[PDB]
Amino acid sequence: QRAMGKTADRSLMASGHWVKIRVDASGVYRLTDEQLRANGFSDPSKVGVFGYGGGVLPEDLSRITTDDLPPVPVLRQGNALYFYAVGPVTWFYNPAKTTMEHTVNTYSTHGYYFLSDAAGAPLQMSQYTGGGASAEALIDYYDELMLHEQELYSPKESGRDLYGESFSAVNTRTVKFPLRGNTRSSGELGTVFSYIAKARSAGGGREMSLSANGILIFSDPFSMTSNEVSNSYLAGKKRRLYRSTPMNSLVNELRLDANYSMTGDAVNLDFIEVATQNDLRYDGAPMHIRRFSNLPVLGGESCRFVISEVPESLVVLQANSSLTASLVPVKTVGDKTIEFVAPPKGQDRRTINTFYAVDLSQASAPEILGAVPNQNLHGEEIPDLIIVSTQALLPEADRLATYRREKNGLKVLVVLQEQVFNEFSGGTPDATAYRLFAKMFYDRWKANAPVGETFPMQMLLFGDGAHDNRKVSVAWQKPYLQQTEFLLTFQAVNSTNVNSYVTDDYFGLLDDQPASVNIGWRNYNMAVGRFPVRTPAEARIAVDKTIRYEEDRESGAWRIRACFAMPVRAFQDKKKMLETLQSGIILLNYAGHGGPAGWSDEHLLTLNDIHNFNYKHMPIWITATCEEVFLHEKSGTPIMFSTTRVVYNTQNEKINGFMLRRMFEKAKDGRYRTMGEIIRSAKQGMLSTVFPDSINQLSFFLMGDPSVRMNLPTHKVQLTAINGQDPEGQYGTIMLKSLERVALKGKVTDEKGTFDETFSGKVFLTVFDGRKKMTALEEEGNDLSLVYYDYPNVMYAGIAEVKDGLFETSFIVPKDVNYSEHEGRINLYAYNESTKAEAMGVDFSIRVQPGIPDEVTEDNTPPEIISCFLNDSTFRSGDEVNPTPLFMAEVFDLNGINITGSGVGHDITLCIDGRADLTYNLNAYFTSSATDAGVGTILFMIPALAEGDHTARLTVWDIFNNAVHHDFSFRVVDGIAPDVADVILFPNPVRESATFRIFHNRPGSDLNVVVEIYDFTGRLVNSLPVKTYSSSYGEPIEIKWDLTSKYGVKIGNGFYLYRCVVNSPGGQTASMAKKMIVVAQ
Amino acid sequence: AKTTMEHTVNTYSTHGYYFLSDAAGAPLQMSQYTGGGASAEALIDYYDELMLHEQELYSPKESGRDLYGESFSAVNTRTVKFPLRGNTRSSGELGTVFSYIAKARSAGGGREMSLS
Ligand SMILES: [Ca+2]
Ligand SMILES: [Ca+2]
Ligand SMILES: [Ca+2]
């Protein structure tokens, strides 16, 4: 049909009991009913075996015909079931060398399977059908394969392979193979001897020689040039010697003696495969009967096999795999002698069929690892992001997931790599399991996806990866390194293990392209990114860095602030200048070779060790314009692009990175593309144009969350007039005077600076009288501890409506600090409520000037009572209130309210029923507005008053002695008003910590109150909860705040909105939002 | 002050290290105790056997040099059994130093740590 497309809508693992088991050797294993009952299988009759085993999945996806959990055929005796398991070593036929060769599973040390009742019943094994009717030959022996292989050393560069025993010190190493009963005394001894060698000196009489039981098999000459010895990357010549040697008297043990003639060289044995000619006779041990040597028949032609000494508790399975195991129907031909007819080799002339003869009385249990929870990855909806995590790292992964789900609004799926292996490789670790899991969604998406649209999903490998995936090499032997779980690494091995590069791009190759297309030339369908973190501490740091990046809105305005002109100019080859504004340069990080050959191999074991994780050196350049284009490096983006291999151009010119002329072009959604997609399209574009520049074929790592967007504004806020003057291009030019009403006007534009009439919502803006500057407190001591005058005074802070791209507001300059030289600062942040889009701007055109001391006796205008309420904002004079009302009043005088104390009746006072008995000095309850010049606020809890009508007068005086009165009435009704509270922030602006003092109307009573903080986009930063009690005695409550967000990250500088809510039983009463400015973050 | 003896855990080591060596030439021979006074102002019928329950489980970095043990976050009651040995007297004064740390998650409330 061109591809496979039977991805199940629901996994088998979604229900029933599941128990993971494993093997370390191919053979028949057995599970008794007692063992099954003992592992939770209430009814053992319903249990079946599932999975693939060891032996890797094909990288040619078309060859994978199965999906979800494949049922394994099983033989069932009385109170036990049997199945043929497959270990990590598996063998294939090489028609050139007319022999069989082995293959070690790079990802696993074992073949994992599953036991489950979910089935309803086991898949009963069937009779073998391929057994031909007529045999073209009667066979007297089969080929017994054996394999000596020590996975000791792992040179990162060489390949996917590990190497064994060294001949550096020991010039002769002996390997003994046990020869088993049915081995023939005399016959041809087939041997594949694989080793690697790098000479320490040039030329010389160097030779690797093998002799079995004293008979010399071969003597291989080895040599190297002065330039080959002098090279660092050469790192050894791999050699594989095939050969059949007629041998005599091979009976109990086969002693192989490998000798390298020279001491001091870097020479290691990889493995020895040994193939003996054995009789078809049961020798008290199961036998994998295979026949390829001296074949007297053609591919697909049948042969009569006759085994003697069989115990008849023995069966013969034709088992090339676990999923294809079939019971060979035999016939008895004599005492303990059975016969069957079958093809030793397939009709394809590339397959050697395996006939496993085994005495089922001797079969024993596999390794029962235990029960596994139900799962259903197959039934998941197509997410935006897939986070594949290790166990330890899971809550830190889920934290990032929750952040992405909440802030970025997107479907994110978190899974454990174990889970992926369970549903995509029958529980066995395999790099292809990741790829298949992704492919499941890709295929699903493609079905209904419109023509032209690219696959939107992304994958985040939340974990570090080891080059030696099995952690079997000597360097890995160490409990931390051992007991840590890593994600798999995929190593793109080229033709005949010449070179190899480790890559995560493999996981994003989900198309149904043909097998002729190598891993290098296939289409990168899905963006993949990795956080090479080992421990949760590492992980939290990564996630915190990624979260804080998106939230620090002020870091993104620094790249937009570059309008004053490591700025390197790029020499390349109105509408032309517009394309260069959207351009960007990514520079590759080149992970070096820090160690003298052997060090690197013993100490640089994982991706993290190689590509040093801590996002390092200038990675992303933005090309800016006011030939040679000027480009600047901006904002510490969590992402890092890393390679080890170096890449050159025409005539060895080293490639430092790439430039995307359309990097910062916004998508249909009006947002920039995610780094993941930017890189994906980039990567995809390098193979798409590898016809003109064939020499290069670079692969690099996206180390970071692929869902990260460059913190760079989509829209900018631009002031157009300040007190009538045009501020664009001006620095400390527009003069503002103390107590002067300043009128502001501005617009909202796109990133290119074009006016955006579609932008309509609110704009938040804070005005400082100067700039933050380091100040050293001097003295006649050489040491001078220093601060930041982190109090450029806030002149004004407020919100304004933005209609059809524009806005206008005004404010009064406070009578405050103007000794500051140079410019002031206006921060602006706009939010378009409908598109949820954010705009930002910074202006330095204002400069404050000295307020001359004239018209000082002019303030004859008394303070203005802006508002004066009890409990709620909806209070008219004479309304029904409770015996302890919460008195709130906003007040205003241009020259300030007198809090001084004493000096006749100059105090702020509340005199209930014109009696000294009930006259309250409210100087201690007044809090001057840090945000609105001349404004102040009184907040007091009126002590208990008796039921009935009452009257009260608020009197407030200013510094210039002018007074004002405000009379109002209220009826006290016992238990009528709702519960409500208000809060004041001390200090404001906020530097390091914030304190919230809450006042309420129900004293001496418990109440659920909470202080809520919001950002200019309206999103809740956090909700600090508090409980009052009988122990307060009508005293306000205080809350200290460390400025940490709901995601456990410190908030950045900016305009926030604080308020408090009282969670009563019958409803929830909130207070008025109040401006909060943060400055020392 | 508390007219009792208190313990102290070596923060840097789990063991007491020593050395064996012939370098000496001969061992330092232990001497007889001299401080044993000629006349006794009292004949005593018992001594103070000290025991110590201490689990070094949690290490709040801020708090101190000390590690803390068993939590009462989930389990509200934790029992500790000390073996009492032969020469322990059936009846007598039971001296106890009980050290714990506590941060409330809500204000006020009837919270009490009780030993029995
Ligand atoms: Ca190997
Ligand atoms: Ca006045
Ligand atoms: Ca302790």
Quick one: three-class SS letters along A828-880?
EEEEECCCCEEEEEEECCEEEECCCCCCHHHCCCCCEEEEEEECCCCCCCCCE
Q: Residue A850 to residues A236, A650, A820: CA-CA distances in angstroms?
A: 79, 65, 10
Which of A313, A417, A438, A428 minimizes the C-alpha distance to A375? A417
Strand partners, A148: A272
- Chain A residues within 8 A of B107 when measuring between CB atoms: 1026-1029, 1031
Q: Give distance in angstroms: CA of B56 to centre of ligand 3.
A: 5
Instruction: Determine the Cα angle at A1057 with ends A1056 and A1058, to 5°.
Output: 120
The reply to whether omega before A989 is within 30° of 0 (cis) is yes
Which ligand ends up closest to the CA of B56?
3
Residue A368 C-beta-side C-alpha neighbours within 13 Å: 17
Residue A468 belongs to a domain with what CATH number? 3.40.50.10390
CA distances to A191, A265, A278, A815, B106 from A211, in Å: 11, 21, 21, 100, 80
With beta carbons under 8 A apart, name residues in chain A contacting B110: none
Q: Cβ of A769: how many Cβ atoms within 10 Å?
A: 25
Please, where are the H alpha helices in A195-274? 226-230
SS3 A233: coil
CA distances from A709 to A339, A561, A702 (A): 69, 19, 13
Cβ of residue A599 closer than 8 Å to a chain B Cβ: no
End-to-end CA distance of chain A: 60
Residue of A nearest to B106 (CA): A1027
Give SS3 for A931: coil
**Cα end-to-end span (Å), chain B:** 24
Tell me the torsion sign for CA atoms A466, A472, A476, A479. positive
Residue A35 sits at φ, ψ, to 5 deg, of -60, -40
Residues 6+ apart with CB under 8 A from A784: A776, A777, A778
The partner residues of A256 in beta bridges, in order of sequence, read A175, A212
Burial of A85 (C-beta count, 10 Å sphere; 0-12/13-18/19+): buried
Measure CA A263 to chain center: 48
218-257 in chain A: CB under 8 A from chain B: none
Residue with tokens 């035999």: A330
Q: CA A482, CA A507: separation in Å to the nearest integer?
A: 25
Coil, strand or helix at A563: coil
Number of residues that this document lists for chain A: 1081
Which ligand gives the minimal distance to the CA of A272? 1
> Cβ of A1031 under 8 Å from any chain B Cβ?
yes
Collapsing DSSP states into helix, strand and coil, what is residue A738?
Answer: coil
- How far off is chain B from A1000, nearest CA to CA, in Å? 17
Between CA A247 and CA A250 the distance in angstroms is 7
- A483: tokens are 């007991």
Task: State which approach was used to obtain the coordinates.
Answer: X-ray
Strand order in the sheet with A909-912: A880-881, A963-972, A948-957, A909-912, A919-921
Q: Given an 8 Å threshold on Cβ–Cβ distance, is B107 in contact with A1030?
A: no
Nearest CA in chain A to B109: A1029
Contact A1059, A1070 (CB under 8 A): yes
Chain Cα centroid distance, residue A81: 43
Task: Tell which phi-psi region holds residue A753, choosing left (phi > 0), alpha (psi between -120 and 50) or beta.
Answer: left
**Cross-strand bridge partners of residue A855:** none
- CB neighbourhood size of A1049 (10 A): 18
Q: Which residues in chain B have their CB less than 8 angstroms from residue A1030's CB?
A: 108
d(CA A640, CA B41): 80
A264: left (phi over 0), alpha (psi -120 to 50) or beta: left
Q: How far is CA A1039 from CA A664, A857, A983, A994, in A?
A: 44, 42, 10, 8
- The chain B residue lying nearest A1037, using CA atoms, is B107
Q: Is A139:A279 a contact under the CB 8 Å cutoff?
A: no
Q: What is the DSSP string of A28-88?
A: EEEEEHHHHHHTT-SSGGG-EEE---SSPPPSSGGG----SSPEEPBEE-SSEEEEEE--S
Cα distance between residue A635 and residue A618, in whole Å? 10
3-class SS letters over A97-145? CCEEEEEECCCCCCEEEEEECCCCCCCECCECCCCCCCEEEECCEEEEE
Residue A198: Cβ within 10 Å count: 19
The answer to whether the Cα torsion of A840, A845, A846, A847 is positive or negative is: positive
Strand partners, A800: A763
B106 touches chain A (CB under 8 A): yes
Residue A595 CA to residue A605 CA, distance in Å, equals: 13
**Which domain range does residue A493 map to?**
377-531
Residue A269: enclosing H or E segment and its boundaries? Answer: strand A266-279
- Structure tokens belonging to residue A196: 């690697």
Contacts of A1026 in chain B (CB under 8 A): 107
CA of B81 to the centre of ligand 3 (A): 18
Annotated binding site of B for Ca(2+): 54, 56, 67
Interacting residues of A194 by C-beta distance below 8 A, sequence separation 6+: A238, A239, A240, A241, A269, A270, A271, A272
Indicate left, alpha or beta for A848 from its phi (over 0: left) and psi (-120 to 50: alpha): beta
Q: How far apart are CA A236 and CA A229, in angstroms?
A: 9
Q: Are A895 and A962 contacting, i.e. CB atoms less than 8 angstroms apart?
A: no
**Does A10 lie at the interface with B, CB-CB under 8 angstroms?**
no
Q: Tell me the C-alpha distance between A90 and A54, whole Å.
A: 8
Output the CA torsion sign for A395, A398, A404, A407: negative
Do the Cβ atoms of A321 and A86 come closer than 8 Å?
A: yes
Q: Cis (ω within 30 of 0) for the bond into A987?
A: yes
Q: A501: which residues sit within 8 A by CB, 6+ positions away? A: A491, A492, A644, A645, A699
The reply to whether residue B108 touches residue A1031, judged by beta carbons under 8 angstroms, is yes
CB neighbour list of residue A391: distance below 8 Å, 6 or more residues apart = A416, A418, A485
Q: Are A177 and A258 in contact (CB under 8 A)?
A: no
Show residues of chain B in contact with A1027, CB under 8 Å: 106-108
Q: What is the dihedral of CA A677, A679, A685, A686, to 10 degrees?
A: -160
How far does the centroid of ligand 2 lie from the alpha carbon of residue A911, in Å?
22
Check CB contact of A495 with chain B, cutoff 8 Å. Answer: no
What number of other Cβ atoms are within 10 A of residue A38's Cβ? 11
- Listed resolution, Å: 3.3
Distance CA A784, CA A87 (A): 70
How many other CB atoms are there within 10 angstroms of residue A608's CB atom? 22
